[PDB]
Amino acid sequence: GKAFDDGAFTGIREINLSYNKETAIGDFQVVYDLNGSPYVGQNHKSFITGFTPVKISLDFPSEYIMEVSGYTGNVSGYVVVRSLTFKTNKKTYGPYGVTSGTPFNLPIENGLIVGFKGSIGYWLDYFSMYLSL
Amino acid sequence: GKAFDDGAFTGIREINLSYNKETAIGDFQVVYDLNGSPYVGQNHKSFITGFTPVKISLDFPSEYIMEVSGYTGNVSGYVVVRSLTFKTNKKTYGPYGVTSGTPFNLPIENGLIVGFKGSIGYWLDYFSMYLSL
Amino acid sequence: QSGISQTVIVGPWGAK
Amino acid sequence: QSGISQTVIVGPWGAK
Ligand SMILES: CC(=O)N[C@H]1[C@@H](Oc2ccc([N+](=O)[O-])cc2)O[C@H](CO)[C@H](O)[C@@H]1O[C@@H]1O[C@H](CO)[C@H](O)[C@H](O)[C@H]1O
Ligand SMILES: CC(=O)N[C@H]1[C@@H](Oc2ccc([N+](=O)[O-])cc2)O[C@H](CO)[C@H](O)[C@@H]1O[C@@H]1O[C@H](CO)[C@H](O)[C@H](O)[C@H]1O
């Protein structure tokens, strides 16, 4: 895939991602907060089309993600991120994608997700999260 | 179970845990580093006894945990931590316990586990980890 | 503020 | 020892 790295910001205003019922997460883009300003992150797009767009708009700064979870598993047959769910102190957005394969979760008791980095080809290959107080 | 919280330290020198191959993790106890000196954490002991002791002794400071993983699953009607695996930069420790149920993993790209908290009844119910740069 | 230093905590895994 | 600030990063989940 094409490696992407947003780096680290002040928090998260919005997540734009797309997915396919049959395969996996495709596109990923974040609108971060940067010292009180929306920071529009670069849209990291799949190499292919066919996905269902989803928009996760947060009530920043009162609403914030408390748990990222999902599934990784094989697709044509690359290990990719098939599924994502974002749970905040207000609600649960997802699951989006196919909920099959190896489940993962990151719940946070103290701290904030402040960045994403990863790689996308046909599908979201992997990702990591910056965490901060 | 009985709740516990070690707090934060400088790093990890040793993990002493116990388990049984039919059930789950039983006891958990950590020798932290505190500013270049060992600090013996409290021993968090199951309500029951009979588990197989394990000592993980790390070559601190050059050796450190890069990933923690295992399984959560039901034992006698309780959700508990059924297995743990500790992966350092030098080798893997585990699995200990029983690898059945729902997998979880925390890989770390940048930063250090510097404390544990959780609860233990007959088995380790849950735990969380303090992370620091 | 508090006089007590703070740290990132991830988890819990296990009984929710 | 450089001028780039650093943060805790957890991950990756997915491929190698
Ligand atoms: C960037 C690239 O050359 N390949 C991507 C792409 O791979 C394909 C190629 C063909 C088909 N297909 O005609 O159905 C599907 C996927 O998507 C993959 C999954 O999204 C990967 O991103 C792949 O890149 C390769 O990924 C593997 C990771 O498992 C490894 O990283 C390779 O070095 C990388 O090229
Ligand atoms: C503290 C307590 O009363 N029970 C612990 C204990 O429970 C048992 C009881 C019986 C048997 N047995 O016959 O073999 C096994 C375990 O250990 C459990 C698992 O380690 C729990 O810790 C349990 O506490 C209860 O845990 C649940 C969470 O699953 C909940 O938090 C209840 O508040 C708590 O009492």
For residues A17 and A130, is the Cβ–Cβ distance under 8 A?
no
CA distance A64 to chain C (A): 15
User: Closest Cα partner for B115 from A8, C5, A48, A46?
Assistant: C5
For residues B9 and B32, is the Cβ–Cβ distance under 8 A?
yes
Q: How far is CA C4 from CA A29, B42, C12, in A?
A: 36, 21, 22
CB atoms under 10 Å from CB of A121, counted, come to: 15
A10 Cβ contact partners less than 8 Å away, ≥ 6 residues apart: A32, A33, A34, A35, A36, A114
Q: Which residues of A touch D4 (CB under 8 A)?
A: none
Q: What is the CA radius of gyration of chain C?
A: 12
For residues B73 and B80, is the Cβ–Cβ distance under 8 A?
yes
Q: What angle do CA B27, B109, B68 make, to 5 degrees?
A: 15
Q: Which two tokens stand for residue D6?
A: 């650093």
Name the fold adopted by A1-133: Vitelline Membrane Outer Layer Protein I, subunit A (2.100.10)
Q: How far is CA B13 from CA A45, B18, B47, B51, in A?
A: 43, 17, 26, 22
The full 3-state SS of A52-99, as one line of letters, equals EEEEEECCCCCCCEEEEEEEEEEECCEEEEEEEEEEECCCEEEEEECC
CA of A86 to the centre of ligand 1 (A): 26
Amino acid at A40: V
Residue nearest to atom 29 of ligand 1 (CA): A78
B-contacting residues in D 1-16 (Cβ below 8 Å): 6-13
Rounded Cα gap, residues B115 and B129, in angstroms: 6
For residues A128 and D9, is the Cβ–Cβ distance under 8 A?
yes
Rounded Cα gap, residues A43 and A55, in angstroms: 13
Rounded Cα gap, residues A98 and A82, in angstroms: 5
Experimental approach taken: X-ray
User: Closest Cα partner for A49 from A26, A70, A76?
Assistant: A26
- The ranges assigned to domains in chain B are 1-133
Residue B58: half-sphere exposure toward Cβ, Cα within 13 Å: 26
Cis peptide preceding C12, ω within 30 of 0: yes
CA of B39 to the centre of ligand 2 (A): 30
Residue listed under structure tokens 């508090």: C2
Q: Which two tokens stand for residue B107?
A: 């890989």
Q: Which two tokens stand for residue A106?
A: 């990151």
A50 sits in which H/E element? none
Contact yes or no for B128 and C15 at CB 8 A:
no
Amino acid at C13: W
| Residue among A48, A75, A78 to mutate when testing ligand 1 (max atoms within 8 A of CB) | A78
Ligand 1 touching residue A19 (CB < 6 A): no
Q: Which atom of ligand 1 is nearest to the CA of A121?
A: 22
Collapsing DSSP states into helix, strand and coil, what is residue B5?
strand
Q: Which two tokens stand for residue A61?
A: 């700064």
Contact yes or no for D10 and B111 at CB 8 A:
yes
